[PDB]
């Protein structure tokens, strides 16, 4: 009854892609694989992070983010201030399984034309179906969120209600960078079992790979603890700074689970992360609620907003080379609060125009965006 | 047996006025401390007070005697650059106040009289007032409460190294030096939270309701208040950093008065000042599982021998606060050679300092590893 969970709705019936969009998406993905990924925390990876605005920052720069204001993005890219998730891959394996397509993760990708706009999608579906043949999901991005207190809505506007707007802008920027058309917005709630006993207790009788209370997959997770830190540290720095070893596939039998845990222990002497991280605990998880919503790219609507992003990045490049004016800017934001974007960026645009006498740039955020007004309205009460 | 059997009266003072000299000096010092204004912790004016001094948690790092941070991060922090915890502190206080029969007060950040760049903020100081009336011998005794989750609490071995981790010992030393007191109780607590109110009332000790029958330590309730600015945020920092808490009035409450306090607190929450900025979130039920207390006395001479190093470090901080260019190129220099190489980093810093102060007689810091750095390196490798 396990094979009944593999949906074949996206299996492509032909050997070669006939429709044009499938061909272009596959070709673009093949171009993406040719783009070199880089090792973490070293090499050009710094020259990739500092040279662009990540997709999660674009919602803030648009003045359409409900928690951060543009000045924090401006100061972050200049190294100043004021004073992912651990289950993501599990979601990837769920989507790859139930939709019968191979999903690959790729590092940070910068847009070809506007290099200062970059994004890192949680995964892109390849052309290969799992049960053989091609798949219709080729080139479809994956964006997976794990809210803890927020309730997942399935009705209402796609831009506002089903998908939170800042996440919607993140997906739009991701689709713009990778030059793809579709992205699946997957929202998952995960509970962890107290013990292995409770894990085997909640097993669905007819199907061992599911939970009997949520009718969704369950599995294991290996936690690798940082060494420098932790050892005897005392807070939540340890949680964020853990890395994880993930199971090979879902719907594992209990024996295969324990055998894989042990083999992972023995071979961790050769695991690179275990040499730099210590095997901590073994977590047992189950999916409790999974929603998926297709999001398509509006390219013209984003290109209309590219000029604003260009002006913002020009401000970043400006204050990166003038440390004195950056200090006096920090004092100016110290005076009037950081949510007052109109005055802050009027000051910033003056500072910019003072040394660039041929810039037609006008101050940004002079009027609240419609989303800013909506958020402030939601604040009352 | 009533809960009053747990109240130790060993520190009850029999007279009305303090006769002995040390009690008089400690009480007078406490009265002097009360006149110095403290700010609303965690918010602005406090955070501005911290930037003008080296806090007690930084001294272990500056001494090159901290196993997790190196002095360069303290230097860069004070110049505005980069690159089961506090929530139960009050609960710990209420435990210490109960079993030791003394009133404990919080006093915020205090700066040292002579060296104003050395400041400390104790988790609490015992007043002269005993709980059952009269004076107490614990007047002026500092309180420092720690909540390890993975660290094992040791009961034997060195006080400076084994019972109290060395960095914590230096924190307590700085607190005793700043507050000009003589003794501090180092309290270490482990707390687990109940799944349900049912488990709370079931785990009540029969003869004494205020204790747990499985841990033989106090249990109680706690009200969690979530920030309003953040509603649906998917960060764990969301409220857990920005949350405020409503605490019970006393320990050893009966179940009925517990429920009455929860209900009355919920209903009256609208007249609360916090009601306009915070929402009642969850109600947590806690019990203590392990509590250790260890007396630590001040070694004033050993700290004053180390004050010159702190003065030189703070002079470096004041130096780079005025030279943004040299701070930028310093940060790039720390990008080159790693942050753990304090000898090279602060040789560079001493060069940069002597270039504009050609007669300050300062020699490079951290040219040789401290013995504690050696021990930590042995444990790390
Ligand atoms: Mg991103
Ligand atoms: Mg993501
Ligand atoms: Mg402190
Ligand atoms: Mg503390």
UniProtKB/Swiss-Prot annotation, chain A:
Location of this fragment in the whole protein: 142 to 531 of 549
The name this protein goes by in its record: Uncharacterized protein R354
Superkingdom of origin: Viruses
């Amino acid at each position: 009854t396990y094979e009944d969970l593999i949906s074949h709705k996206h299996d492509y019936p032909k050997e070669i892609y006939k429709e044009s969009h499938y061909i272009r998406r596959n070709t673009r993905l093949d171009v993406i694989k040719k783009i070199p990924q880089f090792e973490q925390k070293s090499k050009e990876w710094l020259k990739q992070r500092t040279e662009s605005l990540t997709a999660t920052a674009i919602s803030v720069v648009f003045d359409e983010d409900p928690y951060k204001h543009p000045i924090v993005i401006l100061l972050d890219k200049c190294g100043r201030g004021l004073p992912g998730n651990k289950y993501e891959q599990i979601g990837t394996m769920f989507y790859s399984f139930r939709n019968n397509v191979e999903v690959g993760e790729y590092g940070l990708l910068q847009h070809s034309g506007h290099k200062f706009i970059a994004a890192s999608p949680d995964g892109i579906c390849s052309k290969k179906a799992n049960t053989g043949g091609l798949s219709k999901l080729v080139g479809r991005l994956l964006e997976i969120k794990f809210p803890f207190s927020r309730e997942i809505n399935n009705s209402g506007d796609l831009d506002g209600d089903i998908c939170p707007h800042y996440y919607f802008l993140q997906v739009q920027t991701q689709l713009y960078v990778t030059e793809m058309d579709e992205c699946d917005f997957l929202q998952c709630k995960i509970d962890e079992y107290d013990s292995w006993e409770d894990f085997v207790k909640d097993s669905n009788p007819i199907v061992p790979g599911l939970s009997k209370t949520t009718n969704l997959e369950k599995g294991c997770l290996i936690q690798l603890s940082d060494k420098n830190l932790i050892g005897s540290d005392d807070k939540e720095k340890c949680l964020y700074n853990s890395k994880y070893i993930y199971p090979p596939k879902l719907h594992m039998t209990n024996e295969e689970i324990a055998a894989w845990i042990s083999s992972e222990i023995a071979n961790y002497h050769n695991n690179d992360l275990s040499e730099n991280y210590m095997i901590d605990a073994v977590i047992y998880w189950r999916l409790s609620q999974v929603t998926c919503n297709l999001i398509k790219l509006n390219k013209e609507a984003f290109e209309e907003k590219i000029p604003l992003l260009q002006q913002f990045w020009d401000y970043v490049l400006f204050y990166r080379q003038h440390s004195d004016k950056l200090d006096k800017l920090i004092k100016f934001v110290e005076k009037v609060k950081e949510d007052n974007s109109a005055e802050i960026f009027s000051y910033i645009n003056e500072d910019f125009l003072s040394l660039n006498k041929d810039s037609k740039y006008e101050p940004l955020y002079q009027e609240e965006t419609e989303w800013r007004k909506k958020y402030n309205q939601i604040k009352a009460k």
